[PDB]
Structure formats: C-alpha cells, structure tokens
Ligand binder design. Structure first.
Ligand SMILES: N[C@@H](CC(=O)O)C(=O)O
Ligand SMILES: N[C@@H](CC(=O)O)C(=O)O
Lengths: 911, 916
C-alpha cells in the first residue's frame, strides 16, 4: 500500500532502520499523498505515467542498466507539450517534498552523546560541538579562562552575506507552504486518532496547495523581496533564541552575566540589488529601491511585534522613565485609545510604535511616490534612537526589582534591534574594475590631460593620490558620459544620498591593482560621501591572486590610504571564480597560500584583515561540513571577524527550518571563536612541496582541456544547457553559469577536473606519495575538507546522464572527446576514493549519502526530460510519435525552465 | 534519604546523566539497602560509623583534602578488633555490590549504531565489532568471500585457560547469591506493578543480607581440590549455556552474509582448560594426588552436568517418527532411581529409548569417577561408561540424523544441536588440565638418575652434553629408573607426577609447561621423563621463557629443537611456546618486557615458518590481552602478524573471571570477542611498525630497563623499603628476583601505588623527548596509529586511574622508618613525572578521558577501596609495632588484627581487579 512505496524506496537506500531514522518513511508518506493528488487533479492514467517514470528511473539508479534509461527516454519523448509540463512539474515537486523531509530528518536526528574529539567530528551535524562544548574545550584543553573566552566572544563579529538564488528565488507564499507541509509531517509523528486523521487531511491539502502555486522574469526588486523571506520565517526569531543559548552556555562555564545585548556578534548583509557586476539591470534605481525596501521591512517587523511587547508590559512600577512618560502623555490593531499614565512602559513603547510606523511609511512613500513630507524627528534615522527608549525600559525594570522580567521579551527585542538595526541587511555594492577605469578615462580625456586607460600602474597611482587631495572637483556638468559611465557615476550619487547604515562594502570585481582600489576611493571622495564604504578588492584569476600581496603592500604603504582605512581592511576571494581560471585543486591551494601571505602583510603593517569568503568554498556547504571547513582556515585568517557568503542555493537548507537555523547560527559563532584560539595544524613542508607540484600539474590538465582544446567550447555548447541558460569563450563566461551548466548534466567537470592528473602524477612520481596523501587526508583539515567537497559532488554525479546527452545532442565527431572526459571522471573519482580510504562514495557520511541517494530518481527523470526537450528546442525537424494526451500558449521553453529549476533544487550546492 | 546518597555519589562522577546510565542509581540503591541491613544486624551506631567512613572517604576522593584522610584515620584506629572486622566486612561487601552493579551497567549499556571503523573502536564494548560485523569487514573491506571466512572459522581454535584467583576463589554458594542480587536489581528496573516492586525490594534486601552473612573466615586455607571446585563454578552459572547461545549467534551471522549452513556442531572452536591442581610451580601443596583428584573431579562434574540436563532433552524428545537406523537401535535396547523416567521407556518413544541409554551411561561415568575419588577404585567396567567423547556423540548424532531424515531438521537444530555443541566443546572433561613445573626440578630429577647410574652429574654438564645424552636416551633400549634409585621428597613428587600422567586418560590433559625454561635441553628433559613412564599420549612440552635474557636465548633454543629429527618427528608439525608478561616485567620492567615480547614473538613465528611448524603462542598473565572487556578485543588485534594464525590460547586470570563470565551477557560477549578477534587477525594484521619506531623502541627499552633495574635490584635498601611500605610479608598467609610475580604486583597494588606497572616508562619517555624534541610527536603518532603501542599505554593509564599517591604517602608515614621515607618520596616524584609523560603521549589532560565509562566505574569504587586502605595501614602499624597505642572507643556493634588484615587485603584486591 504505503508499505509498497516504502519497500520501493528502501531498495535504493537499505540497511539500518533505527528509530530516529524516518526519512524513507517520510518520503513514502509524501509521495503516497502526492500520487493521490495527481490522480484527482489529472487522472489515473497520468498518475500511472508518473509512477512509471519513477519506477524506470529507480531501476536505472539501482542497477545502472542503460536500457532502462533508454526506456524512460522513449516514454518521455512521446509526451505532448502539455503532459510533458505536468510530468516536469510533478518531479520538481517531488524533489521539494524530499528536501522538506530531509530537513525534518536533520532537525530531529539524534546527537552522539560521547564525542571522540578528532576534528572529523566537526564535519557532521550529529557529532559537532555546540557553543557550550566549544567553550569547554577552550577552557579545559586550551587553558583559557572563562573570562578570556567571554571577552573574545564579546569582541567577535560574524557576518553572513546573502546572495541571489542562481535559478529561482522561492516566492514568499510557497516557502510558507513548504513550511506547513513540513510541520504537518512533524506533527504526524508526535497522537489521538482523530488528530492523525485531521493532520493527515491537512498534509494532503498543503501538498496540493504547493503543487498548484505553479504560474515574464522577476524584477531585481522582487528578487530581493523573495530573498528576504527567510527573515520572517526563521532568522528574526532565531537570533534571540541563539543569543539566549549563549547566555545559558556562559552560565554553565561560570560566567554570571548575560551576553551583552548590544555585542554585534551577528550581522546579516546582502548583494541583492547591490551586485551589478556583469549585470546592467541592477541600476542605481534598483539600489535605491532595495535600500528603501530593506528599511521598510525592518521597521515593519519591529512595528508588528511592538504591540505584543506593549501588552506584556503592563507593570506599573523608576523616576527617569516616570518623567519621560509624563512628557509624552489611532488606526492600529491594539492600542487605539490614548494610553493612561499609570501604564508607563506602554506610554514609552506607544511612542516607539508611532515612530516605527512613521519610519515604515516614509520609506513606502519614498518608494512609490519619489518623496515624502514626513520629517526626521517623526522617524528613526539612526539605530540609537530606537535602542534608547528600550534601554530605558530595561533599566527601569531592573531598578524597580524586575531584572528577571527585563530579560524576557524586552531583552529579545533589544537583541533584534542591535542585530538588525534599521536595515535588516546592509547592502554591498559590486562592480568590475574596468568600469571604474572607463569612468576615470572619460574624466581624464574631458579634462584634456590624457587617457587614464593608457597610463601605467605607477602613473595611475601618482595621479589618483594627487587628486585624492585635490582642491577642485573633477566632474564638471559638461562631462560626456556613455550609458555605462553614467550608470556607474549615478551609483555613487545614490551612495551619497542614502543613510550610511544602508551599506556595507564596495567590492571591486576583477581587481588586480593598487590603483583599482584607489580609483573607487577617488570616486567616493568626489561625491563627498560622508561615510565612504570600505573598498574591498576581489582578486579572481591565479595571476591576480599572485599579484595581490604586492598590491596590498603598496596600499598599506600609502599615508593617505592608511589614514582612510583606520587600521582595517577587507579583501574578497572567490573560490568558483579562481577555479574557473585554474581548476579547483589549484585554486584551493593557491587560496590557502594567498590568505597566509596577506595575513602576514597585514600584521606587519598593524592592519586588521577580514577575508570575505565568496562563493564556492568548503565553508559555503552548510550544515556540519561548514563547521570543520571554518576550523580548517589558515591560522589568523579569521581573528575574531568572519564574513562569509550564504549562497542562494543553500539558504533554504540553512535557515528554512527553525532548528537548522539555530544550528547554522551556532556553528558560525562556535567555529569563529575557536579558530582564533585553536588554529588547525600547519602543513608539513613535504605537504607544501607536494601540493605545489600537484598544483602545476592540475592547472596544466584543466587549462589544456578548457582553454587550449580548440573544440572544447563547441562541445560545452552542445553537451550542456549553457546557451539556453542565457534567459570570448570560457574566460568570458561567468562562474555561476559554468558551475551550473555542468551540474545540470550530472557531470560536474568544473569541480573535479585537474584532481585526476594531480593524484596520478604524484603517485607515479613516487609510490610513497599515496601514503603521504592519505595522511594529509586523515590529519590536515584543509586537505580533508577539500577532498570531502569533491566527494560530495561525485555522489551527485552520473556519467550515464552525460552519455545520454552526448547521444542526443553532440555531433558524432565530438562524441569521443566526451567519452574521454568520462574516463577522466572515472579515474579521478577512483583516485579520490583511494586517497580518502573509501570503497564507496561518502562511506564516511552515510546520512548525507542516503539523502542524496533518495533524490536521484527524481533528478534523473528531469535530466532525461531535459535532454529530449533540448533536442526539440535545438532542432525543429526532430519529431517522434507523440502519445494521445494523458492528462485532464505554453511551450518547450517552459518545460525546460521547469526542468532546469527542478535539477538545481535537487543538486543544491556543488562548486 | 536515597536522594541524599545518590547526590553524594554524583560528586565523584558527574556530568552526562543519560537514560541507559543507571550505575550511580544502582549503587545508591544497594548502599541504601545495605545500610538498613547493618542497622538491623549491628545497631544504629555501627550504621552511623559505616556511614561516616563512607562520607569522609567520599569527600576525600572528591576534593583530595588530606584533613579528610586524617579524620578517617582517627575514626578507624579507634575501633576495637570486633568493630574493625564489621567495618572491613562491610566495605568489602560494598565493593562486591558495586561490581555486581557495574556488570549490570556493562550488560545493558547501549551500542553505538555508526562505527568510525578506526581500530580504537575495538578498545570499547559499546563500539567493538560483533561477529557479524567482523564477517562483513572481512568480506567487504578485505575482499574475502563468505566461504573463505566460513572456512577459516571452521578451522579456528580459541582456548581459554582458567587460573586460580590469586587472593580468594569465591565459593559456589556466594557466587549464586551475588547472581540473585544482580537479577533482583535488574528486575527492579524492568512492566513494574507497585507490589512487584515492594516484593523485589524485599527480595533484594534479603539477598544482600544472605551474602553479607556468608562470612566465615576459617583457620585452614582451602584445599587445592576445593580451590579447583570453586574455580569451576562459572560453568554452571554462565558458560555451560553461553557456549551454545554464542554458537547459535554464529549461525545467524553466517546466514546474514549468505552462508546457508550452520556452523558445524563439532568444529572445536571453543575449548576451556585449567591450571587448577596442575600448576605446581613453586607450590609443593599441588601433589600428584591433587592432580589425580582434580582430573577425576573435572570428569565427575562434566558427566554430572550432562546427566542432569538429559532428562529435559528426553521430555522434549517425544517424537514418534524415526528413521530405520534409529528404529533398529531402539529395538535392541528395549530388550536389554531417577527424577523423571523411572519406569521402562516404551518403544513407540524411540528417541527416549536412545537417550535413556545415554543417561544410564552418563550416570555410570559420573559414579566411577566418584568411587575412584573417595574409594581408590571401582569395579565399574569400561563398557558401562563413556571413555571417549565420540561414544557420547554417536547416539546424539543418530538422533540428529533421524529427525533430519524424518523431515524435522528444524527440531533437530534446537536443544539437540545445543547439546551436541556442549558435548563437542566440553568433552568428557570440562577443562583439560595443564601441568606446570620449573626446569630446575627436572634437572634435579635427571641429576639423581645420572649420579646413581655412575655416569656423572647431569647438573654439571654443559648444554651440548645434556643434549647429546638426552637424544641417546630418547632412543634408548632400556629404562633409566631402577627400583633402588634414591629419591629426595622433591624428586619423588616430580616422578610420581609422571606416574599420574601415565594412568589417567589423555583427554584429561593439555600441556606440560616448563617454568623458567632457558634451553633446548629443558624441553628434552621432560620428553625423556614422559617416555620413561611410557605415557601412551605424551603431553606437548611448552617452554615458558621468563627473563629478558631467556627471551633473547629462546630463538636459538627453538631452532635447535626444530633441527632435531627425534623432536620434529615427535612434534608432528606443531609447537606451543608460552610467554609471561608479569614475569618478564619483574625482570626488566613492563615497557621493556612489552617490546621484547613483541619482538620475540615475531622471531619465533619466523623460525616456525622456516621449519614448517605451526606455532601457538600461549599468553600468560599480565598482558593487555588479559584485561577483559573491550580492551581485550583491540589487544588481540594488536598482536604481531601471524602470531595467532587460527589458534588462540590465552590465560583468563582469576581476578578477571568474574567480570568476564559472571553475567550472561558479558559471558556471551567475552566468547564473541575472543572468536571475532582471532578470526580477523589472521586476515587483517595490524600495521607493522615503521623503522623509526623500532629504533626508538629499542633505545627506550635500554633506558627503561636501566631505571627499573637500578631501583629494584641495585638499590641496596630497596628490598627493605618494600617490606615496610607494602604488606608483602603479611601476604605470606634471594630478594625480588626470587619473589614470584603475583606477590610483586599484588603488594604494590595494595598500596595504590603500582610501581611494577609504570616503573621505567618515565625514564624511557623523558630520555626520548630530551634526545630529540621531535620524538614527542613520533610517540603521539605511535599512540594514534600503532595498535601495540596504544594498547600498551592504555593498560598503564588504567592502572594510574587506580593509583593514589596519598595512600602510598600515608603507608610511608605509618610504616617506613625515617631514613627510608625520602626514598619513598622520590618514587612518588617518579610516579608523577611518569604519569604526566604518559598523558602527554596519549593526548589527554585527565586519566582515561578516552574511556569515561571505565573511569566512572573505577571512580565509584575508590571510596570503598580507600576506606579499606586506611584501615589496612593502621592495622599493619598495630600488628608490626606493639609500642603503637591508641584510645579505642567503647564497642559500637550490637546483636583479631590478622583477621582484619585478611579482610582488608581481599577487599582491596577485589576492587583493584586486574592491573599488571
Ligand atoms: N549541503 C550538502 C549537500 C546537499 O545536501 O545537497 C553538503 O554540502 O553536504
Ligand atoms: N578490567 C578493567 C579494569 C577494571 O574494571 O578494574 C580493564 O582492564 O579495563
């Protein structure tokens, strides 16, 4: 029955049916209910068709018989456009279901009571240290006093920077539906029979509601609002829950005070409407809009919880607040008459409410009108104005003997205010160096002094330092401006006009020089920005990384810059970007080294350095693995301040479920604290040498395939949906489409290519290297974590899918090239297994393996569907006999979009 | 009330109060009930006194405030002889209670579901591989086919040799009481109606009391015969049934890896043996008559056990369908004073007709042994009795086949298969007896012969001359011993031992171990004495090489034996050699013995191979392999490559038998890990040491042995210190070279100081680290990566957890003269430095942080052990110094010193269990 579907699913994932392992059951239950829904909505035949795709696809994943893939192919090419959309919709939705189930399983999986203490424990959610356990290791194993631990945490800073979903920001409505499905599932395993019957019917109903929210592309403004949804869903509440647990952990190590409510321990930021790199749709107007939206939403969140705080704050008992209440003494849900003065905390909070309302309304009018007449004194323009009256309530309760009450909801609110400020996320701006060069070259030519672009690096620096202390402005009204130059100058206009608490960093993409950084500083001074954004270079190519040290050295040598920077500098690294240039192995090692070198240079100059981790690192995986990934960082690269990218495709895993949200915040904080007092071992010299030797080879293999093979590009454009995803060659292609196109094929070339040659050569040069590599794997956190990510990527790989795409889409003369990349994949995988000490992929993480494995049949169905869809899109003369319509003006591009989104939702993070 | 004692116990063992962790509760409950008992039996004041010793002792262990030890001292020296016995009795009994509770805790502790696969997992009961998981690692990780695994297990042999409790063999009656206490405790945590709880509470109470009042200490120590019977008790209690339970699990594991047959009932996988009444080494009370007696007892008990279960098998075997082979046999027997089948069996009950005959035969076998034992002879003839195991199997195999042939395979594989396995494992004698005697006794015997024959003095002869004469007489054409040979009592005792071997059936015996073996000739000497007595089936001769120098000369000695045609022909492809960790460690220090023993086994393995001889290394006491529990499992897997090779033979030390076999689950798991580890090791050897490691180990051995020997043998006043700091002399009821290993370990264990286990490790580590700072890291890698090194360090770490330099310091204040105290002081500094070095090498801050369940177990015992230590210390002052006086309190109990000391010594030994 349900028993039958359960049995089916267990053939792919068998063995240890323990008591907290319910994942297969959850999946069975959801799939069962969804198959009924499909029958009701679309008819028995369609249900049977979906069931048959699933079955065929399961059998192919079980035994890997390519006849099975071909059968599923036949079935799928025969479907008319309409049936084909329903099938793609069905399997995408099954994926979202399996992901909700898996989150529930990770949320309730049992922790290991006794931990071995090896660093490997920190790779796994069930064994990793929580905040208390981290405190205790630091006190007992590293001989820190509890006070020292407390003091470091007080000064610590963790900043999570949210980026756009590369394929599909899940809309607010749907995400809530996903939440309720998950909750109904949870509650079903808590239970009276009638409750079960009712929950059962409520589950059924929510699965359907989700499926039928299934309606061209979205505005960046809307993409921003969709990306902010997780605040409401979890983070908003989660921050105070986690800070409260810090309090408890501090108490359990002998610290008899709460973690101060205004320690800036957690900060969130955003690139959404800020990053315009290679993206001219992100205009100045978009930037202004998302700043106002962030401000609107934050005030609105405070406003919509302040009435609850006012109810709870009924107390009648200090003179400081008494006085304020007396001074102060309509269209709202709760306190719509004047508050009486015998309710003093409500008089204060009543004023805070009104002010919050006015702050929210100004932003709304600024947004939809263009201006508002609402004045500064009616509104909060700075976060201290909002804290102040809340601190007053806190103190008044303490002075009147009610400390204990103060530390309830009021303390929660104080923390939310301190963490989220007036703008939930501070926005980073990002733009590429060449755009700044263009802007300056327009200025220099118009001024008649030559062409900045033609100038040497020394000349650029000399001219920029002279104009950074210039007495005249640079830009006259008659400066002629291309659209691109205007768009870049008007971005600074927007920075000059919006409050500084809207913004974080100005990241320079494709940075290579001292002058790139100075260029942006000059444009900010020219716009007279009261509080210039800090300037952060992103060095992308290997060569750029190699030139970064000399570039920072020079910046830090310049009096004007040192004085401006005030002891602090941030530098950004992008793992996926560097891996596109050099292969992932060589980018990993180079990035390790570069960070060492820049840390040393910072120290020498008495500058505190923050490394901002862009996408594609081990640290962006989420979950347990992020925890060891953080502790693997080179010594002193964190030093009390973490700034990391939370990748769009991981946001749901990290923050969709309340427990996972809590644990994400916890491991980021725990890991940051620990690393500064307990660095991973530094590598043995033999390891460096071998890693250098392996980098040279890995880069040679990767580059010879990706850049020197004259037909690589052509192979890429056929074997991969890259071109269709649009809706020079590889050097010019951006990192996201690179990773994505190969992830859609289940092949992942960008992640593993180069590791094969590195290993083969090392082991062939000297047999003893195998053992050295294995020791590196057991003992060197950096190496372990590097290998693990790639191992996780191979578990999501299926060379049979790549083969099928070759048969359908690649011309015959390219097929053997494809075949040879598949042999490289196999050989690379096997070398990685031998180094990891494993027979099977992920035998060190069987819960992850199970999760990925349950997804495969669904993903595979979408892959097969996609492959034929691309055949049809690409070739209007390919046709087959379509079956008479099975279901009860929408095209092939629509089916492909569903396919791409479904695969990406099942593939989640890779490289 | 009970909540109060619980709180008190948790201060010593705090933290992770999970749901299967009930040890503290068990202990609180037992202590609570026992305090009531003490009130009833001896009065409130005595209860308060016991409570106050406990409390004072708990606080001392918690915070180690020496004021608290001094208070306990004052209290304990004030007690008259009578009060003092009651207190010592009370605290010993508490220990026995805490051990029962701890067993229950180990029995029910939850297994880890997901194992990391590191070998460290096999050090711990909760993570170690069971038999199925061992099968699956061998199939999937070492690429063995299931058939290959099955075939190796079929050919495998695991032999456990049981030795006497060195301090006190627990009598059969008391052990059963301990069992029922444990069961009542178990049942209290099952379900539970309030009246059941009230009834179990009252039953628990009553058993604790029964056990406490089985407390005669008698003038005569126990006869070796009685010591043997007490040592056999565990068979009835657990092992008898446990063997078939475990073999059945092997069946289930085999099935789960795709083998569709049961493990054959007659594969000799498990064998038990004994030294009790067989070892006469340094022990003239173990006479020929004793040996004869325990063989007949072993025979009597075994037949009795079969006899007393055969009636149950007969009831169950009601079936009427038999094959014609059994039909025919039944008809014969139907032509030609018990509990159950006392009328003639009818022939429509064929299986009963067969088993009826087996019963009668068992009875007669049991009775012959009894008459042989109490009369001197019996008229009962061979055909009325079983004289060989195949005769008992035969009719049981017939029943098995008949059921199979009639379609009832499934029934056959129940009780009948269990019985078949018991018969195949225990044979006609539950345990085969090893004989052991020292080489010099044989020399004495041969020297008497040679002088009396007028051909000179065997003792004066060189090794080459010994060999030459022995090989000529081993092919001699006349006997050596004439009627007029004059015989010292010792020579007679040794000759008459061979008489006893000549006369008893060969299935009574296993090995003739030669203690203090050094030579080829030592082994040939025993072989000549056996041939002279015309023993139809001579026991195999097994040398025990004890000193470092002996271990170093063993290779050349085995080479020579294996080179001699006469010996090779006699040995028929098989040789056993014995090693004794405690013995070697007495000579050379435990570190250097551990390393040397590792090397010597490598070298003898190689030599055996070269000569095409299968080698069994028999592990004497004192090794890592003797710890029991989880640690035994990694200990076995740590063995040097090919030192097991399908055949394990290890000592189960008397002080560990209770832990290994008293509780049914622990019994099962002991049998399982001995079988799992043995199978695995032959197909999955531990890594061999890197050359740097050997070099360092060699360098460290030189230094450890220098430190150990300079303290133990060259310090002129060491012996004198030892006799005052330690109860060695009183335990009696040359110098150290001449003292036996058991009293050496024991005497320092009684002081909580354990010098024999750690002495020498300090200098080894210090010197390594000072020679080159990089050695610290090498040592740490060895610890993480080299099983042998890990397991060697762990045992010493476990010993330090049992240590308390404060108790040692107190014994010095009370018993050592002023001019020797600084010597004691400097040994304590060595203990600190050694412990700290070990911790640094293990990567630990606290002792046993890698094994917190063990740490908790040892820690819950300390308050009791400490109370006994303090009591012992002042008792020894009183016994030794009649110018020490104290104001005794008026008698506290309601309703001398040597007796208190005996209780003290036994209680401390029970709580210390195994160390070195
Ligand atoms: N985020 C998971 C992968 C996944 O669930 O897709 C990991 O990196 O381990
Ligand atoms: N048998 C334990 C020690 C003990 O329980 O006393 C061990 O060796 O680990």
């Amino acid at each position: 029955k349900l028993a039958s579907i359960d049995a089916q699913l267990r053939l792919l994932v068998p063995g240890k049916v323990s008591e907290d392992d319910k994942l297969v059951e959850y999946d069975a239950l959801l799939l069962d209910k969804f198959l009924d829904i499909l029958q009701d909505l679309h008819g028995e035949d369609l249900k049977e068709a979906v069931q048959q795709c699933y079955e065929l696809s399961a059998e192919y994943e079980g035994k890997h018989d390519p006849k099975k893939l071909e059968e599923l192919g036949s079935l799928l090419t025969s479907l008319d456009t309409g049936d084909s959309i329903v099938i793609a919709k069905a399997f995408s939705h099954m994926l979202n279901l399996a992901n909700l189930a898996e989150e529930l399983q990770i949320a309730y999986r049992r922790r290991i009571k006794l931990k071995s203490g090896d660093f490997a424990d920190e790779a796994n959610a069930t064994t990793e240290s929580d905040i208390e356990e981290t405190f205790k290791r630091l006190v007992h194993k590293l001989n820190k006093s509890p006070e020292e631990v407390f003091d470091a945490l007080k000064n610590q800073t963790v900043e999570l920077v949210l980026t756009a979903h590369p394929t599909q920001s899940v809309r607010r409505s749907l995400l809530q539906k996903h939440g309720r499905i998950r909750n109904c599932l949870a509650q079903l395993y808590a239970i009276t029979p009638d409750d079960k019957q009712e929950l059962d019917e409520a589950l059924h109903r929510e699965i359907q509601a989700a499926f039928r929210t299934d309606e061209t592309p979205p505005t960046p403004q809307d993409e921003m609002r969709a990306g902010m949804s997780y605040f409401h869903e979890t983070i908003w509440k989660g921050v105070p829950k986690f800070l409260r647990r810090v309090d408890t952990a501090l108490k359990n190590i002998g610290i008899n005070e709460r973690f101060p409510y205004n320690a800036p321990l957690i900060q969130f930021s955003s690139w959404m409407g800020g990053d315009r790199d290679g993206n001219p749709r992100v205009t100045p107007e978009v930037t202004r809009d998302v700043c106002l939206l962030a401000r609107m939403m934050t005030s609105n969140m405070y406003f919509s919880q302040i009435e609850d705080l006012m109810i709870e704050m009924s107390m009648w008992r200090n003179s400081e607040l008494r006085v304020r209440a007396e001074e102060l003494y309509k269209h709202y849900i709760e306190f719509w008459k004047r508050i009486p003065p015998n309710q003093p905390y409500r008089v204060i909070l009543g004023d805070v409410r009104d002010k919050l309302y006015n702050t929210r309304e100004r932003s709304r009018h600024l947004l939809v009108d263009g201006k508002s007449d609402i004045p500064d004194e009616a509104v909060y323009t700075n976060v201290e104005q909002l804290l102040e009256p809340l601190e007053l309530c806190y103190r008044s309760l303490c002075d009147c003997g009610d400390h204990v009450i103060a530390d309830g909801s009021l303390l929660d609110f104080l923390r939310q205010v301190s963490t989220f400020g007036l703008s939930l996320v501070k926005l980073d701006i990002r733009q590429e160096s060449d755009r700044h060069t263009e802007v300056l070259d327009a200025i220099t030519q118009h001024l008649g002094i030559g062409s900045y672009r033609e100038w040497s690096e020394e000349k650029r620096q000399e001219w920029l330092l002279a104009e950074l202390s210039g007495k005249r402005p640079l830009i006259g009204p008659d400066l002629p401006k291309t659209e691109e130059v205007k768009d870049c100058l008007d971005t600074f206009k927007v920075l000059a006009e919006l409050p500084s608490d809207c913004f974080g960093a100005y990241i320079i993409s494709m940075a290579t020089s001292t002058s790139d950084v100075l260029a942006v500083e000059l444009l900010q001074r020219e716009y007279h920005i009261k509080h210039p954004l800090r300037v952060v270079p992103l060095f992308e190519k290997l060569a750029d990384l190699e030139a970064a040290p000399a570039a920072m050295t020079r910046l830090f040598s310049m009096d004007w810059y040192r004085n401006r920077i005030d002891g602090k500098q941030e530098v950004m690294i992008g793992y996926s970007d560097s891996g596109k240039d050099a292969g992932r192995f060589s980018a990993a090692w180079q990035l390790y080294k570069t960070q060492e070198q820049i840390v040393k240079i910072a120290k020498e100059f008495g500058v505190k350095l923050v490394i901002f981790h862009g996408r594609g690192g081990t640290v962006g995986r989420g979950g347990g693995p992020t925890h060891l990934a953080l502790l693997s960082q080179p010594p002193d690269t964190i030093n009390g301040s973490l700034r990391v990218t939370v990748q769009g495709e991981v946001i749901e895993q990290s923050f969709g479920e309340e427990h996972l949200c809590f644990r994400t915040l916890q491991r980021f904080c725990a890991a940051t604290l620990e690393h500064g007092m307990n660095p991973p071992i530094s590598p043995r010299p033999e390891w460096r040498e071998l890693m250098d030797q392996m980098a040279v080879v890995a880069t040679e293999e990767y580059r010879s395939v990706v850049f020197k093979e004259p037909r690589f590009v052509e192979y890429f454009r056929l074997a991969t949906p890259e071109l269709e995803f649009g809706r020079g060659g590889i050097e010019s292609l951006r990192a996201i489409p690179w990773i994505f196109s190969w992830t859609q094929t289940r092949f992942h070339l960008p992640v593993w290519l180069g590791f094969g040659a590195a290993f083969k050569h090392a082991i062939q040069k000297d047999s003893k290297n195998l053992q050295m590599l294995q020791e590196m794997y057991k003992t060197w956190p950096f190496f372990r974590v590097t290998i693990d990510l790639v191992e996780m990527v191979f578990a999501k790989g299926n060379p049979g899918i790549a083969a099928l795409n070759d048969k359908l889409l690649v011309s015959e003369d390219l097929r053997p090239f494809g075949e040879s990349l598949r042999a490289n994949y196999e050989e690379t995988k096997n070398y990685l297994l031998k180094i990891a000490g494993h027979k099977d992929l992920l035998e060190g993480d069987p819960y992850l393996k199970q999760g990925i494995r349950l997804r495969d049949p669904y993903i595979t169905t979408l892959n097969v569907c996609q492959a034929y869809t691309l055949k049809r899109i690409r070739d209007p003369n390919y046709h087959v006999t379509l079956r008479p319509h099975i279901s009860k003006a929408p095209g092939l591009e629509d089916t492909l979009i569903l396919t791409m989104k479904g695969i990406a939702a099942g593939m989640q993070n890779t490289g």
